[PDB]
Write a protein that binds this ligand. Structure first.
Ligand SMILES: NC(=O)c1ccc[n+]([C@@H]2O[C@H](COP(=O)([O-])OP(=O)(O)OC[C@H]3O[C@@H](n4cnc5c(N)ncnc54)[C@H](OP(=O)(O)O)[C@@H]3O)[C@@H](O)[C@H]2O)c1
Ligand SMILES: NC(=O)c1ccc[n+]([C@@H]2O[C@H](COP(=O)([O-])OP(=O)(O)OC[C@H]3O[C@@H](n4cnc5c(N)ncnc54)[C@H](OP(=O)(O)O)[C@@H]3O)[C@@H](O)[C@H]2O)c1
Lengths: 275, 274
């Protein structure tokens, strides 16, 4: 009933430290950050720290201010470097810097964030190779707590969450509805599904009216309200009504970083095998 | 009541022509067919023929017996050639020949079938460039007949239909449900959407119990019974009851070839600039 993520992350990371010891890989991950976004820095250091524990070299390159020219070059140099297995650009970026074109000059087998067109392509086509960290982390919860073959409603249709997630759920035999700010009647769809994955970035959004007693709620939102961190779901309200629910913080979030490292391991071994 | 696609194809072909005049492109599309499949040959001739009418050069390369290695060579040759804008391998193939691995060898900007990873990704990313023809045709019908931002239930999760299609409907603000053989109660989900798109390839699959009077059925199945050709829906039955429905043949069917020609224009106007 309380879908915790910390214990799932540790298992993944043990499994992964396994695979590197007795495989002899030495995966490398470059991180690039532009500005001082506090969320992104915390995300960077969590990946450096878990990398260190697992055996992954993860290095952060901060830049106060960089041109498109110099940044594109830097990525180009990193892309060509065979000792660099993964490359990841952190978000948000400054104005006029578009993630989806920048990210495209990273070869897909270095694309650890897995949001480049080629990687989304293979997910779409059910030949998952590198898969984004959050949709990954939602399925982890499902795998770990025992949810299979269900109807799922995703409230979110972004490239980072609900779109690759919808395609990953179909690759695994789930029945899938996606909806969004232009859906006239969300409540109807969310009450009818076994599972509700929610990522609208709006506190209090998923309340009792949106779910049934049989509901399993996976809260992807992260909101700051009163220096405090909270998801999209009225956690307290539902935890006494719904069948199972991810708390925020402590649900999807503890897994993300490790699922990035998971991608860096797959990438580094695909490089060994193929180049 | 009757959702036909010949008006739509004809209109799209005229627009295509105008687009060719008004930029002076001479787009050319290469077809490769390996085998003697009947439907593929019809499809290829339809592309050639509509291509002739519209101002696109479409040329076809038949084979009886090709090796993987030569085909792969031929495709690299066609890809490196700047005077060939489109490349398409017809289906089906010799056994153990994986379509989806051949096609990643076609530059995404030559890939008019739009089934390659890069073009699937751009659809998913809401940055559509070349799009697959059957989902495009579904969206043609919905547009032409006034059906904007509705609930949709697609019964099909293949990469040729329901997957690109789910993504293309989301880019246009529809709300999307996707089901398949492992969905526990399909009727429950089809009856709750304004629009039901079926493409399961099973005659009589979509019957009266799984739709409503307000329902809009788009029937993508192509099935053969008594040499007669039929959809997945139960057409004679559903025509009286449902609000609108596509005939098989004659609904989505007539738009396909032209949608491939649409990508070929797009593919040509992209190549001029790059
Ligand atoms: N757990 C993690 O480590 C992690 C990772 C990634 C993201 N997130 C979080 O998840 C949330 C979304 O992430 P994102 O990158 O997907 O953001 P995004 O691009 O802004 O997506 C927001 C989505 O929510 C939908 N939405 C917003 N308000 C709605 C409403 N009132 N009714 C129905 N739909 C509504 C939007 O609909 P439209 O498409 O129509 O605009 C959009 O699809 C944020 O809270 C973000 O911080 C957390
Ligand atoms: N109209 C056109 O111009 C045109 C163009 C392309 C395709 N099509 C037609 O559309 C049909 C499908 O095309 P495709 O290439 O996508 O074929 P496909 O790859 O075999 O897809 C069949 C899909 O239908 C689902 N399905 C089959 N039986 C089902 C059942 N009993 N209950 C629920 N779902 C079921 C399958 O579920 P699973 O995923 O679980 O197997 C699968 O996702 C075929 O008849 C084909 O000829 C027509």
């Amino acid at each position: 009933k309380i879908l915790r993520g910390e214990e799932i992350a540790e298992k993944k990371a043990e499994n992964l430290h396994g695979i590197i010891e007795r495989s002899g890989l030495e995966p490398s991950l470059k991180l690039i950050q532009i500005g001082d976004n506090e969320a992104a820095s915390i995300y960077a250091r969590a990946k450096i720290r878990r990398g260190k524990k697992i055996g992954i070299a993860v290095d952060l390159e901060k830049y106060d201010d960089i041109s498109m020219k110099d940044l594109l070059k830097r990525i180009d140099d990193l892309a060509k470097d065979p000792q660099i297995n993964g490359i990841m650009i952190e978000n948000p970026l400054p104005k006029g810097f578009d993630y989806y074109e920048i990210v495209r000059n990273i070869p897909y087998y270095k694309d650890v964030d897995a949001l480049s067109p080629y990687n989304q392509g293979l997910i779409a086509l059910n030949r998952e190779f590198l898969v984004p960290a959050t949709p990954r982390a939602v399925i982890d919860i499902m795998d770990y707590y025992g949810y299979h073959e269900n109807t799922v409603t995703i409230v979110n249709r972004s490239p980072v969450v609900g779109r690759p997630l919808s395609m990953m759920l179909l690759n695994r035999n789930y029945t899938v509805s996606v909806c969004h700010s232009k859906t006239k009647d969300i409540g109807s769809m969310t009450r009818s599904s076994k599972i509700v994955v929610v990522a609208v970035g709006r506190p209090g959004f998923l309340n009792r009216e949106m779910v049934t007693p049989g509901s399993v709620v996976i809260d992807v939102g992260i909101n700051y309200v009163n220096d405090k961190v909270v998801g999209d779901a009225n956690f307290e309200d539902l935890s006494e009504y719904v069948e199972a629910i991810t708390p925020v913080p402590g649900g999807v979030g503890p897994i993300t970083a490790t699922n990035i490292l998971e991608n860096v391991v797959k990438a580094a071994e695909f490089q060994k095998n193929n180049l």
